[PDB]
């Protein structure tokens, strides 16, 4: 049976707002839930292009009105504005 949390353990560690993380989350570089940060810089290349779960949802895109190119959901603005 269990009863009591080891006193030395409490002695080291275990003795409100989520909007407060924005300060360091901006200090912090892109992170992944599955792909470990440390093991990526060790077994993969620093410049590695990554996608979490590539087949999670269908590819998310929108088609330009006039050229009909399939635009990435992140290349749309810059494409309408000048390149089309």
């Amino acid at each position: 049976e269990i009863k009591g949390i080891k006193p030395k353990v409490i002695e080291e560690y275990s003795l409100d707002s989520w909007k407060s993380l924005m300060s360091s989350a901006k200090d912090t570089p892109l992170q992944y839930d599955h792909m470990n940060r440390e093991s990526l810089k060790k077994y993969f290349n620093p410049n590695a292009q990554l996608i979490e779960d590539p087949l999670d949802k269908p590819i998310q895109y929108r088609v330009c009105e006039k050229c009909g190119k399939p635009l990435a959901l992140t290349a749309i603005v810059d494409h309408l504005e000048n390149h089309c």
Binding site: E1, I2, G4, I5, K6, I10, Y13, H34, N36
Partner: protein
Amino acid sequence: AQLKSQIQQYLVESGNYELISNELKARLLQEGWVDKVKDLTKSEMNINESTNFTQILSTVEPKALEMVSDSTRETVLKQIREFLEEIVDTQ
């Protein structure tokens, strides 16, 4: 007492919590569980003809809960145990 949240607090501060999530995640991903649970969900959606989260979750979760190999459950729970005894006096 509330010594259920504090004991969870250590696991995280010691990086032993993510060690267990990942180990479990991995075992589940390889065993075609994640894939099989993702399909079970689509049955309920085409069958019960509904896309309501609460509605579909109530039928998938219990099934998807049995769907875990009794192997994985054991190794991963056993892994959990030997961590608690790192921060818990018996009695």
